Amino acid sequence: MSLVYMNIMMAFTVSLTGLLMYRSHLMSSLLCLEGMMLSLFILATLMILNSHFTLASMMPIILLVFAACEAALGLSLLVMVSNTYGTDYVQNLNLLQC
Amino acid sequence: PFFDVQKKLGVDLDHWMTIQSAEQPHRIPARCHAFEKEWIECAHGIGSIRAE
Amino acid sequence: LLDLIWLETILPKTISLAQMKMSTTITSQKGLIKLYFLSFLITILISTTLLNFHE
Amino acid sequence: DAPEKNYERTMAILQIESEKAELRLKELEVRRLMRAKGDGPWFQYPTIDKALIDHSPKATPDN
Amino acid sequence: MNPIILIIILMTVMLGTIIVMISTHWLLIWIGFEMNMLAIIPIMMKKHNPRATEASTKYFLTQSTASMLLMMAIIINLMFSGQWTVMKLFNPMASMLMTMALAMKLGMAPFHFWVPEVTQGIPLSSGLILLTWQKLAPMSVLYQILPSINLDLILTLSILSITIGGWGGLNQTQLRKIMAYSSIAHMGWMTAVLLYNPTMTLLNLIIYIIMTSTMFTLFMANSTTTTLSLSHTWNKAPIMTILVLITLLSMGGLPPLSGFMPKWMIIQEMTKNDSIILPTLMAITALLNLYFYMRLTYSTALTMFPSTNNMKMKWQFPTTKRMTLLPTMTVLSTMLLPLTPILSILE
Amino acid sequence: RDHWIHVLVPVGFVFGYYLDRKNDEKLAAFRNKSLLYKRELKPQEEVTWK
Amino acid sequence: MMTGRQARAPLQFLPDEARSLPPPKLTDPRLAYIGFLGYCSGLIDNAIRRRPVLSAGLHRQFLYITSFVFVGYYLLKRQDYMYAVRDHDMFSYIKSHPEDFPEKDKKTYREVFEEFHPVR
Amino acid sequence: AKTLLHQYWDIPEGTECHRKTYAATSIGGASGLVVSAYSVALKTPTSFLEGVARTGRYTFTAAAIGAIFGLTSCISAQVREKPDDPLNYLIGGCAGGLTLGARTRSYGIGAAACAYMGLTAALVKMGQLEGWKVFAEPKV
Amino acid sequence: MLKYIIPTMMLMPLTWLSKNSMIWINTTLHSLLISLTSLLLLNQFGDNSLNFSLTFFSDSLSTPLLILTMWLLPLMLMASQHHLSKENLARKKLFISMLILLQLFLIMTFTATELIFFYIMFEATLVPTLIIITRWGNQTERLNAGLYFLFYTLAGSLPLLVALIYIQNTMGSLNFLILQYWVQPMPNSWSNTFMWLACMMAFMVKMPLYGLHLWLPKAHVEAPIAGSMVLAAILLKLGGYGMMRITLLLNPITDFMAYPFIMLSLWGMIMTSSICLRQTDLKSLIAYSSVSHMALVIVAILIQTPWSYMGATALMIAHGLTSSMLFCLANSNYERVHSRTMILARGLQTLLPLMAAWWLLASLTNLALPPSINLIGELFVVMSTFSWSNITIILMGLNMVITALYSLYMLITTQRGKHTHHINNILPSFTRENALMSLHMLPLLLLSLNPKIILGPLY
Numbered sequence A: 001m002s003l004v005y006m007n008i009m010m011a012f013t014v015s016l017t018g019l020l021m022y023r024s025h026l027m028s029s030l031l032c033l034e035g036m037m038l039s040l041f042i043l044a045t046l047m048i049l050n051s052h053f054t055l056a057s058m059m060p061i062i063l064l065v066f067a068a069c070e071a072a073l074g075l076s077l078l079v080m081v082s083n084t085y086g087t088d089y090v091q092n093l094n095l096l097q098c
Numbered sequence B: 001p002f003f004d005v006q007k008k009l010g011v012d013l014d015h016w017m018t019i020q021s022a023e024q025p026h027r028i029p030a031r032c033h034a035f036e037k038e039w040i041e042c043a044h045g046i047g048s049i050r051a052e
Numbered sequence C: 001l002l003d004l005i006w007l008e009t010i011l012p013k014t015i016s017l018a019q020m021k022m023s024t025t026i027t028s029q030k031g032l033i034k035l036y037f038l039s040f041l042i043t044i045l046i047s048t049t050l051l052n053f054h055e
Numbered sequence D: 001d002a003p004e005k006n007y008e009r010t011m012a013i014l015q016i017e018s019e020k021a022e023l024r025l026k027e028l029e030v031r032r033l034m035r036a037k038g039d040g041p042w043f044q045y046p047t048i049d050k051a052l053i054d055h056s057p058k059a060t061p062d063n
Numbered sequence E: 001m002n003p004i005i006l007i008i009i010l011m012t013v014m015l016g017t018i019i020v021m022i023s024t025h026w027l028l029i030w031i032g033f034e035m036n037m038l039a040i041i042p043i044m045m046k047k048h049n050p051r052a053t054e055a056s057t058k059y060f061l062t063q064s065t066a067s068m069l070l071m072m073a074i075i076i077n078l079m080f081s082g083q084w085t086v087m088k089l090f091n092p093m094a095s096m097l098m099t100m101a102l103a104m105k106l107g108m109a110p111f112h113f114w115v116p117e118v119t120q121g122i123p124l125s126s127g128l129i130l131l132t133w134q135k136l137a138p139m140s141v142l143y144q145i146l147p148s149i150n151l152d153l154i155l156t157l158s159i160l161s162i163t164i165g166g167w168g169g170l171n172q173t174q175l176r177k178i179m180a181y182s183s184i185a186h187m188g189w190m191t192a193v194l195l196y197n198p199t200m201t202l203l204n205l206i207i208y209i210i211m212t213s214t215m216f217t218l219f220m221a222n223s224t225t226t227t228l229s230l231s232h233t234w235n236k237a238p239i240m241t242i243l244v245l246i247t248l249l250s251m252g253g254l255p256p257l258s259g260f261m262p263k264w265m266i267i268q269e270m271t272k273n274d275s276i277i278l279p280t281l282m283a284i285t286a287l288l289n290l291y292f293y294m295r296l297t298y299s300t301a302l303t304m305f306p307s308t309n310n311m312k313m314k315w316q317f318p319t320t321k322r323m324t325l326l327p328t329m330t331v332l333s334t335m336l337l338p339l340t341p342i343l344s345i346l347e
Numbered sequence F: 001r002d003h004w005i006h007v008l009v010p011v012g013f014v015f016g017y018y019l020d021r022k023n024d025e026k027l028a029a030f031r032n033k034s035l036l037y038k039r040e041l042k043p044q045e046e047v048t049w050k
Numbered sequence G: 001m002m003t004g005r006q007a008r009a010p011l012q013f014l015p016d017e018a019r020s021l022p023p024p025k026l027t028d029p030r031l032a033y034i035g036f037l038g039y040c041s042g043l044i045d046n047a048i049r050r051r052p053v054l055s056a057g058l059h060r061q062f063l064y065i066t067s068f069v070f071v072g073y074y075l076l077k078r079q080d081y082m083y084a085v086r087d088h089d090m091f092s093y094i095k096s097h098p099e100d101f102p103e104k105d106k107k108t109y110r111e112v113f114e115e116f117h118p119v120r
Numbered sequence H: 001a002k003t004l005l006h007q008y009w010d011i012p013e014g015t016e017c018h019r020k021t022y023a024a025t026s027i028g029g030a031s032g033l034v035v036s037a038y039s040v041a042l043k044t045p046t047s048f049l050e051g052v053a054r055t056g057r058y059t060f061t062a063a064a065i066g067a068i069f070g071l072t073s074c075i076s077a078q079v080r081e082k083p084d085d086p087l088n089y090l091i092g093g094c095a096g097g098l099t100l101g102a103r104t105r106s107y108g109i110g111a112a113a114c115a116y117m118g119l120t121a122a123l124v125k126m127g128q129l130e131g132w133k134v135f136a137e138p139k140v
Numbered sequence I: 001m002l003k004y005i006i007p008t009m010m011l012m013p014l015t016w017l018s019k020n021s022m023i024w025i026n027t028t029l030h031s032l033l034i035s036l037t038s039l040l041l042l043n044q045f046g047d048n049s050l051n052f053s054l055t056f057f058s059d060s061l062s063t064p065l066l067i068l069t070m071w072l073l074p075l076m077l078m079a080s081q082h083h084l085s086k087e088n089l090a091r092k093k094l095f096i097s098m099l100i101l102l103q104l105f106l107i108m109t110f111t112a113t114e115l116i117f118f119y120i121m122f123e124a125t126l127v128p129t130l131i132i133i134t135r136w137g138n139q140t141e142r143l144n145a146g147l148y149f150l151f152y153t154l155a156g157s158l159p160l161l162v163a164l165i166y167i168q169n170t171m172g173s174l175n176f177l178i179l180q181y182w183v184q185p186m187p188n189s190w191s192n193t194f195m196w197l198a199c200m201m202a203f204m205v206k207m208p209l210y211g212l213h214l215w216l217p218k219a220h221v222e223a224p225i226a227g228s229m230v231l232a233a234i235l236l237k238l239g240g241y242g243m244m245r246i247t248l249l250l251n252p253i254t255d256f257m258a259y260p261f262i263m264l265s266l267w268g269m270i271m272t273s274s275i276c277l278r279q280t281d282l283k284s285l286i287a288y289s290s291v292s293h294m295a296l297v298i299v300a301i302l303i304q305t306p307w308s309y310m311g312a313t314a315l316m317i318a319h320g321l322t323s324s325m326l327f328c329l330a331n332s333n334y335e336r337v338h339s340r341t342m343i344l345a346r347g348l349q350t351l352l353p354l355m356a357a358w359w360l361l362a363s364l365t366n367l368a369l370p371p372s373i374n375l376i377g378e379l380f381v382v383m384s385t386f387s388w389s390n391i392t393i394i395l396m397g398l399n400m401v402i403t404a405l406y407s408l409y410m411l412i413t414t415q416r417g418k419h420t421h422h423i424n425n426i427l428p429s430f431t432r433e434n435a436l437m438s439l440h441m442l443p444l445l446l447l448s449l450n451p452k453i454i455l456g457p458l459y
C-alpha cells in the first residue's frame, strides 16, 4: 500500500513497545499511550481523507475526544498514586502481589 | 450476542457510517463507490461462507 | 513397599507434587506492572514471529 | 407383566431409539455439509445489507 | 458515594455493554468499551484505599492498551475492507490484533496478569461486576467476529487460560484471587468451544455468571474475603456452609449439578469436530479447579474450624444484608442439569 | 390424620406404579403388531394388553 | 449455528410460526420440575433469613412457585420451537440435496459377511 | 516455528540421522528461547550476565533434550527397522527425560521425565500415525 | 422403575417431616417396605430383559444389584444410628438424606438404558459418598481419603465421558438395547486402544484394580459404618456392572487388551490377600480383602466367558453381603473399644458368644465355604479361568489358601485366645447389633437355596 501508512503503523508500534516496556514513570507510560492514540488519529484520518468517505470524517474527532477523556482519567489515577508515595513510580504499585 | 435492537425497533443508530455506498452529505461519492456497491450487491443475502 | 510406598509414589504423589510445584511457579509473581507488560510484548513477538498467528 | 407386553414395549422402545439415533447421524451430516458449503439456513454469517446503498445520482458521474 | 451518582454510574456501565451488544458499527463498539471502562473506574475506587487505586491503575493500563489495539484492528479493517460493519474481519493481522485486544479485556492468559491483582484490590461487589458483567461485551464481539478468528490462536489462548487458571488457585488463600483464577480457567473453557459452537459458549457464559454471582453473593452475605474467615461461617450461619458447599461442588463440574452442564456440552461439541485430545486435556486440567474448590469446602462445610469468643455476640444479630437473588441463584446454579436441553433457547 | 406420615412412601409407590402404567400406553405402538404375538382380537376385547 | 435463521426477524422470543407448534401442557414434567425449583428457592429463602422454613411466607413461596412456572413455561415453549426449527431445517436440507443423502442398499445378513472372533 | 515441525516431520524415520537430530535440536532450542524469554520477563535477573546465563542454560537444556530425543529415536528406528512404531519415540522420550535429569542434576526428575516424556512422545507418534488432531478444524 | 424412584424420593419428606425420636424408625420401616417391593424386578425372561421405558430397563445383572442396594439402606440405618445418637438432629437428618440420595442415584445407575445417563448417575454417586466420608468420618484422615476417592474416580472417568460421547457421535446412540444390535467389531489400532482404555479405566478404578486401589484402604477405613457398607457392598460393584455393560462395545480388541490387567488382578489377589496377613487395622484388613475379592471379578469380566459372568455377578452379590457384614462386625467391636487395632481386643468369644458365632459365619462365607454363593461365584470364576489358561489355577489355588489364612486369623485374633485384661467396657451384644448381623447373614444363606436369581443375564 501507500508509503506513509508504513511510517504511521511503525510509529504506533514504537509507541506500543514504549507503552509495553516501562522504565519507572507512569507519566511516561501515559505519554506512550497518547502517542498510540495520536498515531491512530493520523492513520484513520489519512484513510478517510484518502477514500473520500465523507461520513467518517467525524470519526477521528470522536476518536480524539473519548480517548482524550480517557487520558484525563489516567492522569487522575496517576495523581492518586502520587498522593500516596510522593512519586509516580510503577515499582511502588506492588501491594497486590499478595 | 448480537441483540439487533435497531432492526427490531426500526431505528437507525449506526448503519449510516457503516459503508461508503450509504447516503452521504451533499451526494458526495467515495472514490470506490461503484466497486463497493458491486461487492455489496454481489454478497448480499448469500452468507459469508458463500460470499468469500 | 508396594501399597504404602511405590504404588502410592508413582500415581498420586508425583502428580500432586507436580501440581504444587507448577502452582508455586505460576503464582510467584512480584506484582510489578513493568514485568507484566514486558511479558505481553514477548507474547506479541512470539505470536507474530514465532507462531505466525497474523498470517 | 405379560411377556407380550414387555416384548411389544421393547419393540416400541427400539423403534423410538433407532429413529433418534438415525436422526442424530443425519443431524451431524447436515451440519457438516452446511458448514462446508454454506448453502443452507445454518452457518449464515452476516454480510452487508444492500438496502443501505444510496442509489441516487451523486455529485460526480464516474461511479 | 452519592446513591444517585452510583445509580447513574452503574447505568452507564450497563449502557456501555449494551452499546457493544446492539451496535453494527466498529466505532460504536470501541465507544462502548471506552464508556464501560470510564464508568467502572469509580466502582473500583469505592472504598478509597491504595489497593483500590493501584487496582484501578492496573485495570486502566490493561484496558487502555486493549482499547488501542482494538482501534488499530478496526483501522486495519477499514484499510483492507473500506467499511465498518461489525462482522468478520478482512485481514488476519486485524483478526490477530482484535483477538489479542479481547483476550486482554477478558483476562485470558498470557494476558491474565491483571485479573488476580485487581480483583484483590477492589470490593466484592465491584469484583462481582468485573468477573460477571465485564465478560459480556468482549464475548459478544468474539461471537460476532468468529468467521475470522484464527483457530490455533484462540485454542492456544484457551488451553493456556485453562492451565494457568488451574494452577493459579492452588496456591491461593484469598477468595477474590480464587474467583479470579476460576475466571481465567472458565474463560478458556468459553473460548475453546467458540469456533465450533458459540451456543455452548453462551451456555458456559450464563452458567458461569450464575455460579460466580452465587459465590460472590455468599461472600458478601458472610462478609468473608479469605478462606480462614470463610471458615467461621458454620458457627454463625450454618445454612451458608451448605450453600457454598453445593455451589463449589457445582463450579467444579461435578454431576448431578448444573456446572457439569457447560463443559460436558463443550466436550459434546468438540468430539463432533474430531477433536479428542483437546477436550480430554481440558477436562483433566479442570480437576485442579475442582481441587481448590474442594479445599474451600473442606475449610468451610465439611469440617468445623475453631472460632473465637466474639462470635457469641454475632449470634444475637440476624443478617440485615440484602442478599439479592441468593436463593434464586443458589437453586439455578445447582439443580439445573435435568433442564439441560433448555440450551436451545440460546441458538 | 393422626399418622399421616406413614402414607408418604406407600402412596409414593402407588402413584409411581400408576405412572409406570401411564407410560405403558405411551409405548403401545406395536401392541398386537409384533410378528410373534399378533392375533385376531377375541370378542368383547379391544386391546391385547393395557 | 442457526444465527442466520433468526436474523430476518431478530429479537423475537417466540415468533408467529412458533404458534403453529403445540404448547407444553401445564402438567409438563419439566414445568413441574421448574415449580419444584421455585419451592426450593422459597425454602432456601426462608433458611437464609432464619425463618421457619415450611411455615413462614406462604405468599412468598407461592410467588416463587408461580414466577418460576411462569418463566419456565415460556422457556419450554421457545425450547420446543428451536428444536422444531432445527428439525425443519434438517428435513428441508435433506429434501433439497438428494445427491448428498443417497438411499443405502440395506443388505440382509445372509450376504453380509462379518469376521468371527472366537472368545476362548 | 510451524515450519520447524514441518522440516522435522517430513523426513522419514531412521533414514537421515544428522538432519533429524538437527531439526529436533532446533525445535528444542526454540522452545528454550521462548521459556528463556518469559523467564527473564516475569523474573528479572540481577544483571545482564545472569540474564544471558539463564537464557543459555534453559536453551541448551531444552536443545540437548531435543538432540538426544531425535538421535535416540532415529538410531532405535534404524536398529529395529520399524519406523511406524511408537516404541522408538518411547525410547527417545526416556532419553530426553534422562537428558533433562542430567541437566537438572537429579535422578528422580530424570526418571519422572523419562516416564512422562516417553508416554508423550509415544502419543505424538500415534497421533502422527492415526491422524489425531489437537487443534482440529471445525467441520460440523 | 418409577415405582422405586418416587418412594426413595418420598423418603426425603419421610425423614425431614418426622418427629425427632421417630426419624430412625420411620426411615427403617419404609426403606424395608421399598426393599420388599424390590422383588418385583425378578420378572426376568430367558430372552428379553425387563424393559420398562426409554430411560429404564433391568436385566438379570442389574436386578440383584438393585435388590441388594434397596436392602442395604435399612441395614445402614440400623448400623449408623448408635454412633450418631449424640449428633445434632439437623445433621442427623442430613446424614439420612445423604444415604437416601445415594440409594436414589444407585437405583437409576443400575437401570440406565443409556450410557451417558449411566455416567451422570455413576459420577453422581460420588458426592453423597464424599460428603458422608469427609463429614461423619471419625479420624483426621477422612479429608485426604475423600480427596483420593474423588480424584481417582474423576481422573478415570473424565476420559470415559469423552469415550461415551465419541460412541454417541459414531454409532449414533448410547442406548444399551440399541448397541446390542448396532455393535461394530473394534479393530486393532492405537485409536481403538485408547478407546478401550478410556472406556475401561474408570471401572478399573471403581472395582478397584491392583495398583490403582490406593483410595480404598483410606476411603473404606476413614468412612463411618454406613459409608463403609455402601462403599464395599455396592459402590465397588458399579465397576463390575459397568464393565459387563461396556465390553459389549470393545470386541475383539479386549481379547488382546485384557492381558496386562488380568495379570494385575491375578497377581493383585495374591498380593492384597497377603497384605491381609499383616494388617493391624482390622478395618483395613477387610478393605484389602475387598480388593482381593474384586480382583476375581475383574479377571472374570476380562476373559468374558459365560461361566465367568455368572460367577462374577454371584461373587459381586455374595461379597456385597459378606463384606458389609464384616464391616458391621468390626463396628460392633469399635463401639466397645473405640479403636480399630485388631490385636487390642481379644478373646471375645469368652464374653460375646452369639456375636462370635456371627463372626464365625461371616468368616466362613469370607473363605468361600460351600454351598454359599460366595463359593458359587468363586468356583465358577475358577472354572472359567481354568478354561482360559490351565496354569491360572495355581494363582487361584494359592489365593484360596491365603483367603482362608486371614479369614480365620481374623477369627482367631479377635474372638479367640485370652481376653484382654484391662478392657472392661465390653458390653453385652445389643439386639440391634445382632439384628444387623442376622439381616446380613440370613439372606446370604437363603440365596444358597435358590442361587439362579443372582447369576446374571446368561443363566
Ligand SMILES: CCCCCCCCCCCCCCCCCC(=O)OC[C@H](COP(=O)([O-])OCC[N+](C)(C)C)OC(=O)CCCCCCCCCCCCCCCCC
Binding pocket: C015, E274, E275, E276, E277, E280, E281, E284, H123, H130, H131, H132, H133, I152, I153, I155, I156, I157, I159, I162, I163, I166, I191, I192, I194, I195, I197, I198, I201, I202, I205
Ligand atoms: C485414574 C487415572 C488413570 C486414568 C486413565 C484413563 C484412560 C487412559 C487413556 C485415556 C486417553 C484419553 C482419552 C481417550 C478417548 C478416546 C476416544 C476416541 O475416539 O479415541 C480415538 C481417537 C482417534 O481420533 P478419531 O477417532 O477422531 O479418528 C478417526 C479415526 N481414524 C483413526 C481412523 C482416523 O483418539 C484420539 O484422538 C486421541 C486418543 C489419545 C489421547 C491422548 C491424550 C490424553 C493422554 C492420556 C490421559 C489419561 C488420563 C490423564 C489423567 C491421569 C491422572 C491425573
